[PDB]
Curated annotation (Swiss-Prot), chain A:
Leukocytes. Expressed in neutrophils (at protein level). The gene is ITGB2. Residues 1-453 are extracellular. It is a single-pass type I membrane protein. Integrin ITGAL/ITGB2 is a receptor for ICAM1, ICAM2, ICAM3 and ICAM4. Integrin ITGAL/ITGB2 is also a receptor for the secreted form of ubiquitin-like protein ISG15; the interaction is mediated by ITGAL. Integrins ITGAM/ITGB2 and ITGAX/ITGB2 are receptors for the iC3b fragment of the third complement component and for fibrinogen. Integrin ITGAX/ITGB2 recognizes the sequence G-P-R in fibrinogen alpha-chain. Integrin ITGAM/ITGB2 recognizes P1 and P2 peptides of fibrinogen gamma chain. Integrin ITGAM/ITGB2 is also a receptor for factor X. Integrin ITGAD/ITGB2 is a receptor for ICAM3 and VCAM1. It is linked to Leukocyte adhesion deficiency 1: LAD1 patients have recurrent bacterial infections and their leukocytes are deficient in a wide range of adhesion-dependent functions. This is Integrin beta-2. Residues 96-335 form the VWFA domain. Heterodimer of an alpha and a beta subunit. The ITGB2 beta subunit associates with the ITGAL, ITGAM, ITGAX or ITGAD alpha subunits. Found in a complex with CD177 and ITGAM/CD11b. Interacts with FGR. Interacts with COPS5 and RANBP9. Interacts with FLNA (via filamin repeats 4, 9, 12, 17, 19, 21, and 23). Interacts with THBD. Ca(2+) 1 binds at S110, D113, D114, D236, E319. The chain holds residues 23 to 481 of 769 of the full protein. The lineage of its organism: Eukaryota, Metazoa, Chordata, Craniata, Vertebrata. GO terms for molecular function: amyloid-beta binding; cell adhesion molecule binding; complement component C3b binding; heat shock protein binding; ICAM-3 receptor activity; integrin binding; metal ion binding; protein kinase binding. The keyword Magnesium applies. It comes from Homo sapiens (Human).
UniProtKB/Swiss-Prot annotation, chain B:
The integrin I-domain (insert) is a VWFA domain. Integrins with I-domains do not undergo protease cleavage. The I-domain is necessary and sufficient for interaction with ICAM1 and F11R. Ca(2+) 2 binds at D497, N499, D501, D505. One of its GO terms (molecular function) is metal ion binding. This is Integrin alpha-L. The keyword Ion transport does not apply. In resting T-cells, up to 40% of surface ITGAL is constitutively phosphorylated. Phosphorylation causes conformational changes needed for ligand binding and is necessary for activation by some physiological agents. Ca(2+) 3 binds at D557, D561, D565. Heterodimer of an alpha and a beta subunit. The ITGAL alpha subunit associates with the ITGB2 beta subunit. Interacts with THBD. Interacts with CD226. Belongs to the integrin alpha chain family.
Amino acid sequence: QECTKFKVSSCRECIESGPGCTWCQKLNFTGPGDPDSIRCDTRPQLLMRGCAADDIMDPTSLAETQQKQLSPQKVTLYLRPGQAAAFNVTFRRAKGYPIDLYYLMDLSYSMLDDLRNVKKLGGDLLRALNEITESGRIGFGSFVDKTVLPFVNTHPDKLRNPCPNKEKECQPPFAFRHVLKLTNNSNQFQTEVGKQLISGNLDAPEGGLDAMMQVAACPEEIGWRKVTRLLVFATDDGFHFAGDGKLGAILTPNDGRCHLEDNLYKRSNEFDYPSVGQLAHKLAENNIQPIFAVTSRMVKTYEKLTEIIPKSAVGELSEDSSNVVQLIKNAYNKLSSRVFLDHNALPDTLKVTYDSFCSNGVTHRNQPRGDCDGVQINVPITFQVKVTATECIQEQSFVIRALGFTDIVTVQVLPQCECRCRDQSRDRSLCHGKGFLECGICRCDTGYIGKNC
Amino acid sequence: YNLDVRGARSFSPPRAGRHFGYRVLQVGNGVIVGAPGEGNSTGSLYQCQSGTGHCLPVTLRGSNYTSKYLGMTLATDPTDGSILACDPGLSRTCDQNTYLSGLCYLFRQNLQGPMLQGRPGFQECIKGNVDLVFLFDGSMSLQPDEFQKILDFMKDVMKKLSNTSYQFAAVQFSTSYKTEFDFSDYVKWKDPDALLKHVKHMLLLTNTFGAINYVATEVFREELGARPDATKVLIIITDGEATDSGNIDAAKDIIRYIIGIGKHFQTKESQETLHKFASKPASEFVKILDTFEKLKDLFTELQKKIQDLTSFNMELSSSGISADLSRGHAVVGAVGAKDWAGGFLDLKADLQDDTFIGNEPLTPEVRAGYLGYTVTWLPSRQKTSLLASGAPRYQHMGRVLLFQEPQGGGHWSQVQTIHGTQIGSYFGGELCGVDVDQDGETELLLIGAPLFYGEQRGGRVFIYQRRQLGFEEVSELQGDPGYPLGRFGEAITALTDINGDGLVDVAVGAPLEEQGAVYIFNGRHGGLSPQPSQRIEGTQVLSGIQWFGRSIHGVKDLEGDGLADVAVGAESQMIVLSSRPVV
Ligand SMILES: *[C@@H]1O[C@H](CO)[C@@H](O)[C@H](O)[C@H]1NC(C)=O
Ligand SMILES: *[C@@H]1O[C@H](CO)[C@@H](O)[C@H](O)[C@H]1NC(C)=O
Ligand SMILES: *[C@@H]1O[C@H](CO)[C@@H](O)[C@H](O)[C@H]1NC(C)=O
Ligand SMILES: [Ca+2]
Ligand SMILES: [Ca+2]
Ligand SMILES: [Ca+2]
Ligand SMILES: [Ca+2]
Ligand SMILES: [Cl-]
Ligand SMILES: [Mg+2]
Ligand SMILES: [Mg+2]
C-alpha cells in the first residue's frame, strides 16, 4: 500500500520500483506540463488522479504448475520484486524400495559378546528387511580406531594383542575393514563375518566416523544399489572427530575421498577424523541414512546427531547386541515417518520458505525447510512453498528435494517486471507520428523530436 | 582494508613439509615457524629472516629428543619477549605400556640464545620389577618414638607390597652408613619385623650426600641381590638438613623420593634444601610432613603412585599440546590427564617444577573432554588475572573453563563454566583474549567453534565480555556464508592496532574456505566490530596455496615500513602482510 519512486519513465521501471507501485495506461492521461511519472503511484493515488480501475497495471507474482510421490515435478514462477508466489507440493508417501543395510560394527574389546551374537544374525537381518519391503541385501564392516599413539598402544606385543592379555583370538587394532559387499546371501554374511576376531585399543572414543566416511565415499566397493540405503552404526561409547587427531600429530584434514586398499583404510593415520558436518554432508549427498545403534548411556549423545544429520535415527542397543533386529525395525519406522522438504543452494536474490501442513495434527509456517512427522504410507501431506525475489532477476532455476529420496521438483524462476498492457489497436494514427504505442505511453522510434512524437 | 595484499611476501624452505606454517610467531626482524613433521619426518622450528627472505631450520642445542610433534606449540610472552616451544611427542615404553607426554623449551632472549628445557607432567617409568631402598635418618635429633615411627613406616610399605615384584633394602645413615639388610636378605625372608630387628639408632649427624652415594655404589649391587632389569627407586626419610655437601651424581639414574619430617622443615627455605636430593619435579618427589604421625597418611600416596593400564593419570598426559605465557608465567595444556579429562600444568620459571590444575570435581562426564586443548591468559591489573582453557570434546560438544590465578596465599580456583551447544562443533577449540581499549584489563574472551555446522556458514567465533559475575556472551564475529565446512574460527589472534586508532584489532583464520581466507575485525568503542573490514583470499597471495589462515600472528613492527606486520601460515607456506594507513 506504499510506493517510493525515483527514476520512473516507463511502466517496467514502475514495477521494478516496488511491489506497491502500479501504472495507469489511460490514453492522454498526462497533462501538457506533467511527466508520465505521475502515471506510476499506489492504487488509491492513481484512482485519486482519475485513472479507472481497469486501466491500473498491477502485476502479481504467479506460479504455473505443470501417481507420483512428489508432485508437481516442474513449476515456473513469475516474480515481481517484493511479492512472493506460492505453490503447493504434495508428498504422498509410496511403498518402500528394497533396502540395502550395511552393518558397521565397533570391534573394540567390550564388543566381544556383541560380536558372537552378530555372527549369527545374517539370516534374521535379511528376513527382517524382507518383512519391511522386497529384495533386501546386507553387508558388514568393522572398525576400532586409528593405529597411532595414544589411540592404540604401539608396543609391538600390544599391537599383536591389543586385547587384555588373557585373550587368545584377537586381531591387531585397525581403522576400518570392509568385510562383506552388499548381498542377499545370508550364508555369505555368516562365513565372512564369522572370520572376524575381536580387537582392542586404548582410549574410549572410537574412530567409527572414519569408517562411516569410507563407507559413504566408496559406493562401488560397498555395493550400494539406487534403493533405500541404511547404515547401522553399532557401538557402546563415544566417537572421535576432527581436531582429535592432533594428539597423534595427525594434522591433515579428512579429504572425504575413498581410500580403501585391500578392503582396509590403510592411510587412516595420514588423515584426521572427519568433522560431524563433513560426514552429514557426505551422507546427504549419497542418500545414506545412518542408524545409530548405541548402548543406553550413549543414546542421548547420539540423538544430538539427528539434529545435524536430518535423515538418521537412534536406537538403544543392548550390552550384547541381541536386540539389534528389533532396533533396526523401530529405526526404519522413525526414519520413514519423517519427511523434510529442502532445496539446494540458492542465490541470495531469492528466498524460499515452507509451510508444512501435516496429517498428524501439526502446522508449521514460514520455515527454511519443510518438516512433517508421523507421515503414513498413502496419506498425503501438503507443503506450501513461497518464493520471493528482491529485484528483477535473470532467468534461473533451483531444485526442491524430499530428503532421503531422489524425486525432485524443478522450479524455474522467471522475472515478471514487464507490464502486460493492451493493444495499440483502435488507437492507431498513433502519436501523430511514426512511433508505436506501448502501455498508453508513446516510445517514439529513436529520434525525430518529442515525447508525443 | 589496511592490510596490503599487493605487497604480501611469502616464505618457504626448499624442503618444507605440508605442516610448515602450522604455527607462526613474529620476533624482531624474523618470523618463527613451527613445522611439525608428516609421515616419518621429525618436526622442526624455522627462523625466517625478514631481510634475506630465507627460512632456516633451528638446531635445538643440548636437546636429546625430537619427535614429529616439534612445531606444534609456539607461544611468546608479550611482557618480556620469552619464547616457549614444546614437543608433545615424547613417547617411551614402560614394560608393555607406552607413555606420551611433552618436552618444552624456553628461549628467554631469542632462538640463538640460552635455552632451558623441562618435561612437564612427566611420569617416570615404574616397572613390574622394582628394587627399592629405604635410606632413613638416624640423627641425634630423633626421639626414640620418632625413630620407631620411621621403622614402622618402612615395615608397612614392605607389608603392603609383600606379594609384588618389589625387592627391598634398608640403610640407616647419620654420620656413617649401615646396610640393615640387602636385597638377598629380603628375598630369603620377606619378613619386615625380622629384617629390621637388629637396627640400632646411631644418634649422630645427618650426612645425606655421602649416604646417597653409598646407596648408589654399595647397595644396588647384583651380587647383593639387585636385579639389573628393575627400576631403581630410593626413598629418603630425614628430620633435618644435611650436615655435609657435594653432589649425588652417582645416583642420578635412581628415582629418588625424599620425606622431610618435623620442626626443622617448618620454613620454606629448609624444605627447599631437600630438592637437590630428590628427582624432578619436586612437587612429586619432595614430601614435607609437619608431624611424625602423618607417616601413616603417606602410605597411599608414596605407594599407590609407586602393567596393562586401562586407566591413565599422567602416563598419556600429552603435556605441551598448547601453551601461553603472560607476565613471566607459563602454562601448558595436558589433554590426556585423567583419562583425557584434561587440565593444564602451571610451570615454574626455570621449567624444573610444575603444578597440575584440572577439572574439579573429577566426574565421569569430564572424561574424554580434552581440557587444556587451548589455554589463554586473560591478564588484568585492577581485577584478578584469569586463565581460560577449552575442553573442545566435553560431552562431544565442548566447553570453556575460567580459572582464577592464586590470590594471596590461595590456590588456583575455577570460577566459571561456558557450555557449547552443538555436538562436534569443537566449541573451545580456539581461544583468544583481547584488551581492545588497552586499559590493562582484558575484557574480551573470544571462543572459536571452528567445526560448527549449519546455515551455510562453517565455524563460529563468539564474543564474551567480563562482567562482575563473569563472562557474558555479547556478540559474534560474522564470517561470510557459502563455505559450510570452511572452519571459520580455527585461528583467532589479536593483531594489536593495525589502523592507528589506538584500539586493538582481531584476525580470524578460515583455512578451509576454498584455499583459505583471513578476516579482519576492527576494534571499536565498547568492543569488537561484528562485521569484517577485510577478507583476504589465499588465492590472491599465492595461486597454488591451501589452508591459508591456519595460523595468524600480529605485532607492531619496529623495522620496516607500515604500522603492523601480520604473519599468516598456510600449507608449506608462511606469508607476511604489512598494515598501512592508506592501502
Ligand atoms: C495449499 O494448501 C493449503 C492447505 O491445504 C491451502 O491453505 C493453500 O491455499 C494452498 N496453497 C495454494 C497456493 O493453493
Ligand atoms: C540376489 O542377488 C543376486 C545377484 O548376485 C541375483 O542374481 C539374485 O536374483 C538375487 N536373489 C536371490 C534369491 O538370489
Ligand atoms: C641429555 O642426555 C645427556 C646424556 O648424553 C645428558 O648428559 C643430559 O643431561 C641430557 N639432557 C637433559 C636436559 O637432561
Ligand atoms: Ca558388550
Ligand atoms: Ca579409541
Ligand atoms: Ca580492556
Ligand atoms: Ca585498530
Ligand atoms: Cl639431627
Ligand atoms: Mg570401545
Ligand atoms: Mg636430625
